[PDB]
Amino acid sequence: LAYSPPFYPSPWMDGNGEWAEAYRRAVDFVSQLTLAEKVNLTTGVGWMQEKCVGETGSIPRLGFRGLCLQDSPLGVRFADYVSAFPAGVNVAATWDKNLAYLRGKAMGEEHRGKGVDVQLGPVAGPLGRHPDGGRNWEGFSPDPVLTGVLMAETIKGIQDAGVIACAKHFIGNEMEHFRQASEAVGYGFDITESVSSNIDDKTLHELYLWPFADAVRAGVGSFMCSYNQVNNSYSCSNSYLLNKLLKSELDFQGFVMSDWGAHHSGVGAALAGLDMSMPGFWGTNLTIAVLNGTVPEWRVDDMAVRIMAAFYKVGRDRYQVPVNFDSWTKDEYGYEHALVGQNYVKVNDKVDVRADHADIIRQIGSASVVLLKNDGGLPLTGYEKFTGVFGEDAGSNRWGADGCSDRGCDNGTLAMGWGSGTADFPYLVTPEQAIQNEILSKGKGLVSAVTDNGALDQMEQVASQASVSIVFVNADSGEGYINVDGNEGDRKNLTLWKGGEEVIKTVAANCNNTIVVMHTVGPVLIDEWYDNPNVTAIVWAGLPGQESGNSLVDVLYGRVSPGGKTPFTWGKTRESYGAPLLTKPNNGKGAPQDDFTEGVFIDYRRFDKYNETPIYEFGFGLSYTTFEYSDIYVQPLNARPYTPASGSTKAAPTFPSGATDGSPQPILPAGGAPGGNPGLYDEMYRVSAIITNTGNVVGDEVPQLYVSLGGPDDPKVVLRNFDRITLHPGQQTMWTTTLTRRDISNWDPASQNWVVTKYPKTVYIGSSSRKLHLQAPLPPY
C-alpha cells in the first residue's frame, strides 16, 4: 500500500512579515491563559450544541466568546436575510479577479453582519480531477492556476471584510464516494476506513497543492483538513501533509481545523499538525497529554497562538458582534439550560445583511455566462413575435426556492448545488419570470413557458409557432450525504437531468431558432445535439444564485456581451476525461485505494496528451463581437539566481521521533516564507501582446497565457496567466504580464525543490487552450 512518511516536529509560528502584528497580539493574549483555556480554543463544542455550524470553547474570564464557524463558500448557510451568491465554478467562468474579490468582500460582509468569525470557504479541494465529482462546483476549475488566482482573490475579499476565511478541503478529496466509512455503510458498502488518495510528490506540487499555496500566500487565516486519507494517512493526522507541506514548505502561519468528524489519531493529530478539532474528549485527552508530557507545552501554545493570530489578522477584535442568528431554527426565541432551570432567550434577530449584494450577484451571473455556440441566434431583441420557453429548468421550485433541505433536489431552475456548500435564497428569479418580464416590457409578443419535461406534445405545439425557442436543461450534484436520484453526491453519469436531451431534440425538431441554456454543476455529454443546425445558440450559465433569471436575460437580450470562458473541458465521451470514479471498494473492508496515476493530466491536459479534440476546449468562449491577437513580445528580466532557503527556526516558545523536539529546526530548501521560498515569485519574463476589438459592439475578451515547459512528461500547454478586458469597437490594448520562477519550474522530488529544467520553454497567448494565436520562445538566462 502507498505510505506517508512522518515529519516531526510540528512547526511553530514564525510571526514574520504580514503576520508579525497578529502574532504579537496573539502571544499577548495566549500568555494570559491557563492550560484549560488554551485547550478550549482547540475544542469544538459538539454537533448542533450552539448556534453556528461549529463553535470553539469560550474564555469567559477575559470576556472572549467561542469562535463561530459557519458555512458556506457561496454565502451564509442556514441564516435568514442573507444573499445566495453564484457558485465558485461560476466565478471560475468569469476569469475575473476583480469579481472574485468583490464576491469575497460581499460574502465576508454578510458573515460579519451575522457575527461569524470563520467562513468555511473557499474551496480549492476538490480541484476537479473527475468531471463527475460531486463537489467540484463549490471550487473553481480543474486548472490549478485559474483556481489558485481566484481562490486568493476570494480569500482577500472575505478577510478584508473582517472575517477569517478557510481554505478547504486539504487535500485530495476529489470525490464523495467513500469519503467517510459511516456514510459509505449508509449506501450499502462494507468498509471501515475512508478512501486513500494515492498522490505522488510531483503531482501534489504541480497540481493539487498549487492553489493552496496561493491561499497561504493570500494570507488565509485557517485551513480545513479533509475526510479522505492521502497515501493511507488521514489528512487530519498526516504529518507529511500538515507539518511538512503546509507548515514547512508553504510555511502556513494560521490554524488547521478538522472537517466535521474527520478521523484523526486524537492527541496524535495535534503532534501531526492539527490545531482544532471540529465539531468536537479531545479537550480532556489534550490536557492530560500536556500534563503527562506526551504533548509538549509549546505545541498547545502554538495551537492557541495560531488560532488567535488568525483572529487578530482579520481584525475580529474590531468587527466581532454577537452571533445574531441560529443555524438550527428560524424561531425568534428558544430555551437554553442554565446552572439552575432554563432561560428563555432571543436566538434570531433577523439582521438583514443583504445590503446591495443583489447587484454583484446579478453581475457575476452575467459574467459567468459562456457562449459556446452562436449561428445568429443571439442576442435577442425582446420584440420577437412569439417566444417559447421550455424545460423545468426554466420554472419555479414548487416547494419554494428553499423548499429542499440543503438544496437536495433538482426542482425547477438550478441555481445552486446541494450539501454544506449552500445558502438560503432570499428569493429566486427564474428564467421563466425574467423572460416574460423582458417580453411584456418591450414588444409584448406572445410568450408561453412549458416547464414539465414530460409535456413533449405541448413543447412540439408551442415550438412549432415560435420565432425563438429558449430551452433550459440542468445537471446537479453535491456533497455525499445527500443522494438525489441515485447520485450519491458524485454524478452517476454526465447526462442532462430529467430527460433534458429529449426536450432539446423535441424543440429543435419543431423550431429552427432554438437557444439552449445549460445550468450544470460541470460538463455534460452534448455530442448528440450541439451540432444540430436548428440549435442556433448554446450557453452555459452554471449555478447563478438568486438573480439567475435577470443575469441571464441581460446577456440573452444584449445588454451584456457574454465574456465568460468555460473553466473545464466539454468532451465527446466520459472516456475522453480519463478513468471513472472509484465507486466500488477495491481493498475489501479496508480503505479503498484511489491511485492518481494520471498525474498532472486532468481535464484539458488529458485531452491534449492523447490528441483528443474537445467539443469545447478549456478557456473557450464566444462574444457578440470579435477580437484579434498580434505582436507578442518577450522581455527577459534577468532575475537574481534562485537561492534554496536555509538557516534555522527559533526554538519552540512557551507563553514518534521528533514529535516533542522543540529545538531549532532546519528550514526546507523550498520553504522559508508563506507560499514557499520567495525566490519562486521572482519575475523571470515580461510577456506582451495586443488585443483588438474588430467587431461592432463593446465586449470583454479573456486573453490567456500558456507555457510549454518542454519536457517529455510535461503537458503541451499549462495556463499561467489571464485577464478580463473590456474593449470598445476598434479599441486596442497591450496585455502585459510576467511569468514567475514558479511558473516555469517543475517539482524535483530528489532535491525537494522547484527547478527550471533544461528543455526549451515556449510561451503562447490566445483565446483558448487550443486557440493559441501567438507564440515565442522563453530565451534561457
- 594 belongs to an annotated ligand binding site: yes
- Selected binder of ligand NOJ within 33, 76, 89, 120 (CB under 6 A): 120
Identify whether the C-beta of residue 230 lies closer than 8 Å to the C-beta of residue 174.
no
Burial of 588 by CB count in 10 Å (0-12 exposed, 13-18 middle, 19+ buried)? Answer: exposed
Please give the Cα distance from 648 to 12 (Å, whole number).
12
| Interaction of residue 249 with Mg ion, rule CB under 5 A | no
Contact partner, 335, from ligand NOJ, its own copies, Mg ion, none, Cβ < 5-8 Å per class: its own copies
| Interaction of residue 383 with its own copies, rule CB under 8 A | no
Catalytic residue among 259, 476, 608, 714: 259
Q: How far is CA 263 from CA 195, 302, 420, 482, in A?
A: 12, 22, 19, 20
- H-helix or E-strand spanning residue 297: helix 297-313
HSE, side-chain direction, 13 A CA sphere, residue 677: 24
Three-class SS state of 707: strand
| Interaction of residue 200 with Mg ion, rule CB under 5 A | no
Residue number with CB closer to ligand NOJ (260 or 601): 260
189-248: which residues touch its own copies (CB under 8 A)? 190, 192
Rg, the chain, Cα only:
26
Residue number with CB closer to its own copies (192 or 736): 192
531-590: which residues touch its own copies (CB under 8 A)? 588-590
Size of the site for Mg ion (CB under 5 A): 5
Look at the block and give the residue holding cell 493530466. 601
- 527 belongs to an annotated ligand binding site: no
Size of the site for ligand NOJ (CB under 6 A): 7
| Interaction of residue 395 with its own copies, rule CB under 8 A | yes
We find the least distance from the C-beta atom of residue 251 to Mg ion, in angstroms, to be 4
- 326 belongs to an annotated ligand binding site: no
- 631 belongs to an annotated ligand binding site: no
Identify whether the C-beta of residue 92 lies closer than 8 Å to the C-beta of residue 151.
no
Q: How far is CA 748 from CA 201, 568, 727, 773, in A?
A: 9, 28, 42, 31
Give the chain's end-to-end CA distance (angstroms, integer): 43
**Annotated catalytic residue 259:** yes
| Interaction of residue 771 with its own copies, rule CB under 8 A | no
State the helix-helix crossing angle for 548-556 and 431-440, rounded to 10 degrees. 50
- 251 belongs to an annotated ligand binding site: yes
Contact partner, 251, from Mg ion, its own copies, ligand NOJ, none, Cβ < 5-8 Å per class: Mg ion
Please give the Cα distance from 722 to 96 (Å, whole number).
9
Binding marks (x or -) toward Mg ion, 336..375, rule CB under 5 A?
A: -------------------x--------------------
Binding marks (x or -) toward its own copies, 302..341, rule CB under 8 A?
A: ---------------------------x----xxxx----
Alpha carbon 378 to its chain centroid, in Å, reads 31
Look at the block and give the residue holding cell 514567475. 740
Size of the site for its own copies (CB under 8 A): 19
Beta bridge partners of 343: 336
Segment contacting its own copies by CB under 8 A, of 163-171, 245-253, 390-398, 636-644: 390-398
Alpha carbon 703 to its chain centroid, in Å, reads 22
Contact partner, 14, from ligand NOJ, its own copies, Mg ion, none, Cβ < 5-8 Å per class: Mg ion
| Interaction of residue 96 with ligand NOJ, rule CB under 6 A | no
We find the least distance from the C-beta atom of residue 421 to ligand NOJ, in angstroms, to be 7
We find the least distance from the C-beta atom of residue 180 to ligand NOJ, in angstroms, to be 9
735-754: which residues touch its own copies (CB under 8 A)? none
For residue 39 the three cell numbers come to 485547550
Contact partner, 259, from its own copies, ligand NOJ, Mg ion, none, Cβ < 5-8 Å per class: ligand NOJ
Residue number with CB closer to ligand NOJ (82 or 120): 120
Residue number with CB closer to Mg ion (181 or 272): 272
| Interaction of residue 71 with ligand NOJ, rule CB under 6 A | yes
- Sign of the Cα pseudo-torsion (143, 149, 153, 158, in order): positive
Please give the Cα distance from 138 to 416 (Å, whole number).
9
- Selected binder of its own copies within 5, 293, 318, 344 (CB under 8 A): 344
Please give the Cα distance from 127 to 125 (Å, whole number).
5
Which are the contacts of 165, defined by CB distance < 8 A and separation ≥ 6? Answer: 104, 108, 118, 119, 121, 122, 154, 155, 158, 159, 220, 221, 222
| Interaction of residue 384 with Mg ion, rule CB under 5 A | no
| Interaction of residue 424 with ligand NOJ, rule CB under 6 A | no
We find the least distance from the C-beta atom of residue 213 to ligand NOJ, in angstroms, to be 20
Please give the Cα distance from 216 to 675 (Å, whole number).
6
**Residues composing the chain:** 781
- CA-based nearest residue to 525, from 458, 483, 577: 577
- Sign of the Cα pseudo-torsion (346, 349, 350, 354, in order): negative
Residue number with CB closer to ligand NOJ (418 or 570): 418
Which are the contacts of 34, defined by CB distance < 8 A and separation ≥ 6? Answer: none
| Interaction of residue 251 with Mg ion, rule CB under 5 A | yes
Three-class SS state of 546: helix
- 357 belongs to an annotated ligand binding site: yes
Please give the Cα distance from 216 to 247 (Å, whole number).
10
**Pure H helices in 500-559:** 500-510, 548-556
- Selected binder of Mg ion within 14, 160, 452, 661 (CB under 5 A): 14
Pairing outcome for strands 229-230 and 68-70: unpaired
| Interaction of residue 420 with ligand NOJ, rule CB under 6 A | yes
For ligand NOJ, which residue has the nearest CB?
Answer: 420
| Interaction of residue 260 with ligand NOJ, rule CB under 6 A | yes
- Selected binder of ligand NOJ within 132, 249, 259, 393 (CB under 6 A): 259
Question: Which residue ranges make up the site for ligand NOJ (CB under 6 A)?
Answer: 53, 71, 120, 168, 259-260, 420
Question: Which residue ranges make up the site for Mg ion (CB under 5 A)?
Answer: 14, 106, 109, 251, 355
Please enumerate, by residue number, every residue annotated as part of a binding site for Mg(2+). Answer: 14, 109, 130, 175, 251, 356-357, 594
Catalytic residues: 259
Question: Which residue ranges make up the site for its own copies (CB under 8 A)?
Answer: 190, 192, 329, 334-337, 342, 344, 350, 352, 385, 392, 395-396, 398, 588-590
